[PDB]
Amino acid sequence: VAEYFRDQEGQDVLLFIDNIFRFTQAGSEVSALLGRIPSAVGYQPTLATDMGTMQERITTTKKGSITSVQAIYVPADDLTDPAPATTFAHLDATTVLSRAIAELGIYPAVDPLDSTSRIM
Amino acid sequence: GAATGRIVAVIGAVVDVQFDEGLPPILNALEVQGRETRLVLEVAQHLGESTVRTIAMDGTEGLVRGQKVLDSGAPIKIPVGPETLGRIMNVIGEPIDERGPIKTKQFAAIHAEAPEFMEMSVEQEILVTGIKVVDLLAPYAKGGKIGLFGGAGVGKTVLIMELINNVAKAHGGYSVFAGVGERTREGNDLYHEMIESGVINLKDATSKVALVYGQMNEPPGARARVALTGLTVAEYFRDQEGQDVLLFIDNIFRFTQAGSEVSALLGRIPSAVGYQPTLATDMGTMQERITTTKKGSITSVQAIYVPADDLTDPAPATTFAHLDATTVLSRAIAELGIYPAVDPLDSTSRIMDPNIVGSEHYDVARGVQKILQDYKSLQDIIAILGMDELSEEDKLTVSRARKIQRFLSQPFQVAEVFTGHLGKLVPLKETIKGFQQILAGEYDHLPEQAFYMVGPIEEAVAKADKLAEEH
Amino acid sequence: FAKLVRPPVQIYGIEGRYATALYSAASKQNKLEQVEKELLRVAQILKEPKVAASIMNPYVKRSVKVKSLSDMTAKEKFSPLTSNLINLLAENGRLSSTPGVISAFSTMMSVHRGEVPCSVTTASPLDEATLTELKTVLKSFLSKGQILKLEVKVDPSIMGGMIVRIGEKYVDMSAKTKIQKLSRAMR
Amino acid sequence: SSDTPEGVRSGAGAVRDAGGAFGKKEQADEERYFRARAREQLAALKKHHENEISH
Amino acid sequence: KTGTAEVSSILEERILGADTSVDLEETGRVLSIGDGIARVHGLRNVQAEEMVEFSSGLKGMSLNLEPDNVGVVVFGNDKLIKEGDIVKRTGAIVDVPVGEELLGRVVDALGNAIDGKGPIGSKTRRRVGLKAPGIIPRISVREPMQTGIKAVDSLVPIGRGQRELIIGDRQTGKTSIAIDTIINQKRFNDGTDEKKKLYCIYVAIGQKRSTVAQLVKRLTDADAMKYTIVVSATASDAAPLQYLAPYSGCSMGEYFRDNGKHALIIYDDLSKQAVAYRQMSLLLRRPPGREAYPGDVFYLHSRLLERAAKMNDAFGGGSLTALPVIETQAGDVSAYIPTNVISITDGQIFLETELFYKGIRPAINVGLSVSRVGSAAQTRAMKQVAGTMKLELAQYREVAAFAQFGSDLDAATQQLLSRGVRLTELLKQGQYAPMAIEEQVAVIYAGVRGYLDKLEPSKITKFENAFLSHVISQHQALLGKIRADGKISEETDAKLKEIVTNFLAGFEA
Amino acid sequence: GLKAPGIIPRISVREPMQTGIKAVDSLVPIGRGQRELIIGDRQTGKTSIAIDTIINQKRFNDGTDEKKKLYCIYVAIGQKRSTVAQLVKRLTDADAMKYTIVVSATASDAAPLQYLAPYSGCSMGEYFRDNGKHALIIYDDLSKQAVAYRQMSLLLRRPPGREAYPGDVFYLHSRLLERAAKMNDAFGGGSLTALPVIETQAGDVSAYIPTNVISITDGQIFLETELFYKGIRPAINVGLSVSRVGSAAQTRAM
Numbered sequence A: 001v002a003e004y005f006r007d008q009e010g011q012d013v014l015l016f017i018d019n020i021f022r023f024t025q026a027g028s029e030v031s032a033l034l035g036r037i038p039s040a041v042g043y044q045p046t047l048a049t050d051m052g053t054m055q056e057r058i059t060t061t062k063k064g065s066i067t068s069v070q071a072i073y074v075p076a077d078d079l080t081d082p083a084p085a086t087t088f089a090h091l092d093a094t095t096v097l098s099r100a101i102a103e104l105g106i107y108p109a110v111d112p113l114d115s116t117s118r119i120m
Numbered sequence B: 001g002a003a004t005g006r007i008v009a010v011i012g013a014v015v016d017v018q019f020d021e022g023l024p025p026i027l028n029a030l031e032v033q034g035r036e037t038r039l040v041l042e043v044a045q046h047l048g049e050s051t052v053r054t055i056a057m058d059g060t061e062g063l064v065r066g067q068k069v070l071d072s073g074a075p076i077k078i079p080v081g082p083e084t085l086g087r088i089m090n091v092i093g094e095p096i097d098e099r100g101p102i103k104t105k106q107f108a109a110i111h112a113e114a115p116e117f118m119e120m121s122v123e124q125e126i127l128v129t130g131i132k133v134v135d136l137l138a139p140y141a142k143g144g145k146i147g148l149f150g151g152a153g154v155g156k157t158v159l160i161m162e163l164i165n166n167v168a169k170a171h172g173g174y175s176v177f178a179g180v181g182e183r184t185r186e187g188n189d190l191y192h193e194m195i196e197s198g199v200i201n202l203k204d205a206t207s208k209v210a211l212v213y214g215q216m217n218e219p220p221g222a223r224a225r226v227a228l229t230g231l232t233v234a235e236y237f238r239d240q241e242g243q244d245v246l247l248f249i250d251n252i253f254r255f256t257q258a259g260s261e262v263s264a265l266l267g268r269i270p271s272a273v274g275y276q277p278t279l280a281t282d283m284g285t286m287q288e289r290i291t292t293t294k295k296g297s298i299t300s301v302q303a304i305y306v307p308a309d310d311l312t313d314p315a316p317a318t319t320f321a322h323l324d325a326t327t328v329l330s331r332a333i334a335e336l337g338i339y340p341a342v343d344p345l346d347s348t349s350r351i352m353d354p355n356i357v358g359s360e361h362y363d364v365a366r367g368v369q370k371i372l373q374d375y376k377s378l379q380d381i382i383a384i385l386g387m388d389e390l391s392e393e394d395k396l397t398v399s400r401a402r403k404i405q406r407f408l409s410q411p412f413q414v415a416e417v418f419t420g421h422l423g424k425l426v427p428l429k430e431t432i433k434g435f436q437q438i439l440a441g442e443y444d445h446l447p448e449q450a451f452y453m454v455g456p457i458e459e460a461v462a463k464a465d466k467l468a469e470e471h
Numbered sequence C: 001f002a003k004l005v006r007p008p009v010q011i012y013g014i015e016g017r018y019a020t021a022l023y024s025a026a027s028k029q030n031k032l033e034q035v036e037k038e039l040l041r042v043a044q045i046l047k048e049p050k051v052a053a054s055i056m057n058p059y060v061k062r063s064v065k066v067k068s069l070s071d072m073t074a075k076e077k078f079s080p081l082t083s084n085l086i087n088l089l090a091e092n093g094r095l096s097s098t099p100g101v102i103s104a105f106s107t108m109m110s111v112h113r114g115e116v117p118c119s120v121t122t123a124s125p126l127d128e129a130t131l132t133e134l135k136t137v138l139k140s141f142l143s144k145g146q147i148l149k150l151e152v153k154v155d156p157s158i159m160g161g162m163i164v165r166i167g168e169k170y171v172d173m174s175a176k177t178k179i180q181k182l183s184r185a186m187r
Numbered sequence D: 001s002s003d004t005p006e007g008v009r010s011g012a013g014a015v016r017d018a019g020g021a022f023g024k025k026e027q028a029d030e031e032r033y034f035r036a037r038a039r040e041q042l043a044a045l046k047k048h049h050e051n052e053i054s055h
Numbered sequence E: 001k002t003g004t005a006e007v008s009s010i011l012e013e014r015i016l017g018a019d020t021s022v023d024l025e026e027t028g029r030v031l032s033i034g035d036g037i038a039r040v041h042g043l044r045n046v047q048a049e050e051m052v053e054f055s056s057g058l059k060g061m062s063l064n065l066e067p068d069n070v071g072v073v074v075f076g077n078d079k080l081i082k083e084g085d086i087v088k089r090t091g092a093i094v095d096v097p098v099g100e101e102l103l104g105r106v107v108d109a110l111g112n113a114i115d116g117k118g119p120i121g122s123k124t125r126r127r128v129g130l131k132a133p134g135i136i137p138r139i140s141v142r143e144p145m146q147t148g149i150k151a152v153d154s155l156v157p158i159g160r161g162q163r164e165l166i167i168g169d170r171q172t173g174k175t176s177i178a179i180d181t182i183i184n185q186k187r188f189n190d191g192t193d194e195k196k197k198l199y200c201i202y203v204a205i206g207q208k209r210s211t212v213a214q215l216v217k218r219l220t221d222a223d224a225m226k227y228t229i230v231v232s233a234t235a236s237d238a239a240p241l242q243y244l245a246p247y248s249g250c251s252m253g254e255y256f257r258d259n260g261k262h263a264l265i266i267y268d269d270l271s272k273q274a275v276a277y278r279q280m281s282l283l284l285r286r287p288p289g290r291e292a293y294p295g296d297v298f299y300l301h302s303r304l305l306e307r308a309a310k311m312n313d314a315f316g317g318g319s320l321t322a323l324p325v326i327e328t329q330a331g332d333v334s335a336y337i338p339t340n341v342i343s344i345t346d347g348q349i350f351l352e353t354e355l356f357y358k359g360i361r362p363a364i365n366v367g368l369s370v371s372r373v374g375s376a377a378q379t380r381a382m383k384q385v386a387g388t389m390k391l392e393l394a395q396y397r398e399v400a401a402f403a404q405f406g407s408d409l410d411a412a413t414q415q416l417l418s419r420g421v422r423l424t425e426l427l428k429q430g431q432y433a434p435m436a437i438e439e440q441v442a443v444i445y446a447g448v449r450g451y452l453d454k455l456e457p458s459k460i461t462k463f464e465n466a467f468l469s470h471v472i473s474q475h476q477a478l479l480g481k482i483r484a485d486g487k488i489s490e491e492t493d494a495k496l497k498e499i500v501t502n503f504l505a506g507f508e509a
Numbered sequence F: 001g002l003k004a005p006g007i008i009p010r011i012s013v014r015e016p017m018q019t020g021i022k023a024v025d026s027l028v029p030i031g032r033g034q035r036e037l038i039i040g041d042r043q044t045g046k047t048s049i050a051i052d053t054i055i056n057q058k059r060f061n062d063g064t065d066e067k068k069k070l071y072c073i074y075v076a077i078g079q080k081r082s083t084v085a086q087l088v089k090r091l092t093d094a095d096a097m098k099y100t101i102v103v104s105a106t107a108s109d110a111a112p113l114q115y116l117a118p119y120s121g122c123s124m125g126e127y128f129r130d131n132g133k134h135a136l137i138i139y140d141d142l143s144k145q146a147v148a149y150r151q152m153s154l155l156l157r158r159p160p161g162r163e164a165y166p167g168d169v170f171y172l173h174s175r176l177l178e179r180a181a182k183m184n185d186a187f188g189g190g191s192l193t194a195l196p197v198i199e200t201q202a203g204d205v206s207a208y209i210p211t212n213v214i215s216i217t218d219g220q221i222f223l224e225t226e227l228f229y230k231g232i233r234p235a236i237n238v239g240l241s242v243s244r245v246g247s248a249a250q251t252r253a254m
């Protein structure tokens, strides 16, 4: 749906996915109902290509572009887990919403020391 | 004889037979011909083209393919009755003590079903054994179910042979000891520890115990069915006669663990850490026949091996629901010399209740456990600040808590060959009174070495005078 | 289900499934000695550069290999229960293993009167006076109303004897007995 | 990794649960105190017992 | 590759002739039985998830439709099925009795009767496998659902039409948060109002039978088995009966949702359905995954725990609330099944066994518990006092290390150690004593306002019991002015000031 | 492959077995007929402990009474021949070899020959025990009779269990360590001690094959590394080296 407003109209699309872990977790369920032998910690062997063929269709072509904004869930506080490792290879930014900055009264609750951007 | 099958494939302890005429159902017994010993195979699966997949109950040496196999028409039929007392019996119901045969007039096939919802006695009681950790902190119940946890070498064959002394001699009803895969050395003591103590009489008919022994030198298909030969003799005394029974089983982890030794040879995909995929189903098929109905009662005491002191293992952690009372022995306590090793903050009963044990028993045992959890928050301070930095209130806590910890220890009567002390048996009314006073402050003026290995609190001041005279 | 007649070989694999379903079906109605004469005539029409061109071709159709053999199996000589069997193998996908079944049915039907022959393995061949004894003293063993058969294969590495195998018997008398003189060198 | 239920946490009285060189430095420190109070108390017993008889 | 139905007896008849003697469109013979899984030759017209009915009287359920046979799980023992036994069809997905003829009765997972009173008299049925409502037929939850526990109603509140996970280790008080949730409803369920009633269901999965028998006697004597259904697939059964048993109980509680009534269901526990499914998959040779669970095991607890809804005015105004129970193993909330069900539901209540022995019972951790809806699912008076209470019991947790060896601190830090240990003493509560809601607004009003700082901490749990018995009897007219109005007006906020201070004088004697 | 004797033909442990070590004989005594497990790491003393025991019975074997002797047996599994031909040297200057047997299956042997070795060595022990005398048997070691069962029974296409070990590694060791009996005096009264050695990785005792054999033996001797290097040699953890004392047949003066 997000490409008609890039290809057929030429605008600056946005796209929200909630969230990028349940896309990954559902690919491991399809791949294990067929019979494929799993990878490291339990995910599917095609984990980076399946994320590849979805995340490569979001670019800036000559007509328009697609931007994306995706929420991420980090399992067991493990930033080197196979699913957020593979998702971090595609990111160009981060945004962190933390519980403490809301207590100060500041809106939106954005942590300006732990939110990054690769094009900085 | 019917359906005289033939053997085709002996791979391990899993024999497959092929029947010409009559296929037998699941859970039967088969008789391999031409052997001087009795080898019994039990049917477990139906494969197609009239071949079944059995499991042997003995050694599979000397099994030549093409060998005939008879059929009895039922599951395994053991002897049962009143004349099975003071005897030791096999898994298929045979004598192993060389006294002659068992002459009974009633047989019971070992596969029965759990009694229904409308046959459930609901009443709770109390039971006094004599121990200051059982009777104070995790009290038993007349008809309940009792499990003894803990690792290897912490005191489970002693705590289960002391309760055989305490309860199972001053009891009117009967008892059964089923040995499910343990050391054959330890199955020679309890046969001789109870001939001199009158519980077994080898000449007359006034014995009060029955023994079932299949040990850890046995193939792992016969170490899964002495758990069921036990509670078939221990059910004729509850159902048929309207009596009261006691059930002693050591060890019940060898029933589960000997089902994981033939899982993949049967043809299943193994589950998590290596167990069979039918863990909580073959277990709960057995642990529902050990109940008290409205025709009788059963008080069951089962020893439960925890492998490698790992309580979150799936073989113990699925047994914590078939039990009323848990006594969990730790090892970090028995390394301090405290015996019985019983953990105070991990044992638990159902009847610890201010409406069954009374509101004086309850206020005591919820202050012993509250001062022992207050100890551990101070032990992390002592490791840095040292003992002579604490305040004067927190020093009073550690001294009473070490007085309580030493007072929970008690010399059993079966430690009269290990330690050389003399044995105690404390009544319940003194147990509550003794612990009530250490929390109050009425023994704050004694050394801790008085309280180690005594009985009542009046013996713990008769030691603090002998220490001061020999000074 | 029903019980079936036991074949006296009982082979296994994808052959002996179908090669016992044919033995049990034809032993009913006493169609046993007849059906081997019909299975040896499909055992010649299978090897044909138009028939074997599509009996093992994957890409023709799943369906047209069923009508093409059913028209073929009925018109020329025979319409017994084998016409259902060729229709049974072709309906399942086991047309590739069709020569395997008839080589499996032949060894199953042979033992109904046969011997599973011996194998004399000695040297360059012999005369009539020493062979017609071994074609008669090898009949004195069995004694069950039978007409024996035999194979011969020449091997010179056996230096000075003959080995023979009546079934799975193997009475060995040869120049292995040089290796049995290890006991002289074995203390 | 402690401000989350998924991130693991510790118990109370875990220093002596390990068995290191702080669990030993504390198991022995308690015996070097409560062995010397055991003969302040022990000496006073003869007098205390007498005192009970007195009053 | 050989194929399952390629045995020597199936091929043997097809060489003889056509199969006219058996029809195979409706009845199919059994190829091979083992460990509660059958293989059936025939049955060409069987729908997926259809009950079959074996020759020996048992039942079945069709799960694997395969190109030569069908694999069907067996209810009951397996010593009755054999090889060569005709199977037939019923013609439908499994269905269960449903009505109001269930109330006060005890049923198993197929709707039969076990308490021995008599057969159920309902005139309706329902399929167990139906779907949730959509995005449209719901509305946001606004109804209080009261438990009677001062912690659960004031710190982690539940509403009607919400999932709330009771998670915690063994021997912690799990089965007892959800047994005075039931007993508390007798206040409303005997009166005259209709949109405050509730009809509870208890599902017992894999427990032993004589813990259920100790629960029909706990609830009869407290007089709450005239609106409670008990569904009981216990441990001695077969494995699919424990698989259906929360679907069988979530269709019994949807008739009360489609008709403008309300209900509440308690799965106890959902960590034994997931092991009962896993036994069934790995004998059907479905491919494993992490911890040998099949791939579709998030699909077990997602299609079940989304049938709990709050419908709207154009569909009846019903509700269904679900409290699922999950047992962890030594605080490990990062295993496979405890991480599915935390992601699905709307909050968890976390009970620890360290707090159970330090004298805090019910043994609730407040820091590791949450409800996602929260302050909208509360009455307007409990919202008023807990907004000052949840904050001040949160400031105590940051300074909770200083309390062990502390007297040389600041007077502000010595205050948070003071006020925070009075509010902890209020939240203690004895077993089988649910409280009315406006009574809890009396007790919590005493602590958080300042009328307990001048007392001793073993005299807090005495003062609360003496403050309640004075205000029930001699002030019953003011515990019905909150139960009707809802909000504490200033005309009541000035009247409770003249009760607590005029009782704090004549107490300490 | 013979069978262990049951409950009737045993008796309790009356006699002592002297090792000559002073940390063993005083603090962790070992009766005759008791399975005692020497466990520890590599290069800590597990072989030397069980070879001072072979040497120390020299004084009883040239004596006069036939009931104080102790005939010994050493089973070498998975060891190179430049250790077993060197241990026969240490056992022949002290003339220790005139009363022992050495059953040897080296690391060069076929994997069904390292599996069969303790079941063959234990069956020469039961010539003594089933005729009157007293034997002793050392398995050096039993972590190399397990990887000869894992390999031999993977190539027979048997499905792996944990760490690819088969289903019945517990049944492999248990049907071995129960022949170590102590018969009653109406059969002959003979005994058969056993001293299984177990090598563990990084001093961790909670592994799969250690815990399956801790719970078959009556007592243990925990050999460590920080005892060996600080200076306590033989490096026996006398705190943890528990022992079901064997009816306390230490001796009267000790």
Ligand SMILES: Nc1ncnc2c1ncn2[C@@H]1O[C@H](COP(=O)(O)OP(=O)(O)OP(=O)(O)O)[C@@H](O)[C@H]1O
Binding pocket: B320, B321, B349, B350, B351, B352, B353, E169, E170, E171, E172, E173, E174, E175, E176, E361, E362, E363, E429, E430, E431
């Ligand atoms: N609020 C409370 N006050 C006092 N005792 C309590 C309280 N809650 C629970 N208990 C005690 O806890 C014990 C066990 O609790 P319960 O069995 O209900 O918890 P559980 O975690 O569900 O245990 P399991 O999971 O084994 O069923 C009971 O004997 C009961 O006396």
Ligand SMILES: Nc1ncnc2c1ncn2[C@@H]1O[C@H](COP(=O)(O)OP(=O)(O)OP(=O)(O)O)[C@@H](O)[C@H]1O
Binding pocket: F041, F042, F043, F044, F045, F046, F047, F048, F049, F233, F234
């Ligand atoms: N009583 C002792 N005092 C001091 N050192 C000793 C003693 N006994 C043995 N050692 C030394 O310790 C080292 C290891 O001993 P040993 O070879 O018995 O260990 P091991 O664990 O059996 O070796 P491996 O791991 O190869 O089996 C040897 O160098 C030996 O010389």
Ligand SMILES: Nc1ncnc2c1ncn2[C@@H]1O[C@H](COP(=O)(O)OP(=O)(O)O)[C@@H](O)[C@H]1O
Binding pocket: B151, B152, B153, B154, B155, B156, B157, B158, B159, B334, B339, B340, B341, B412, B414, B415, B418, B419, F243, F244, F245
């Ligand atoms: N009174 C006692 N309390 C604690 N332990 C004892 C006592 N008496 C002896 N022991 C020792 O504790 C050990 C416990 O082992 P045991 O209970 O026999 O087997 P298990 O390994 O099944 O616990 C025994 O070997 C014994 O030496």
Ligand SMILES: [Mg+2]
Binding pocket: B156, B157
């Ligand atoms: Mg034991």
Ligand SMILES: [Mg+2]
Binding pocket: E174, E175
């Ligand atoms: Mg419960």
Ligand SMILES: [Mg+2]
Binding pocket: F046, F047, F140
């Ligand atoms: Mg060595």
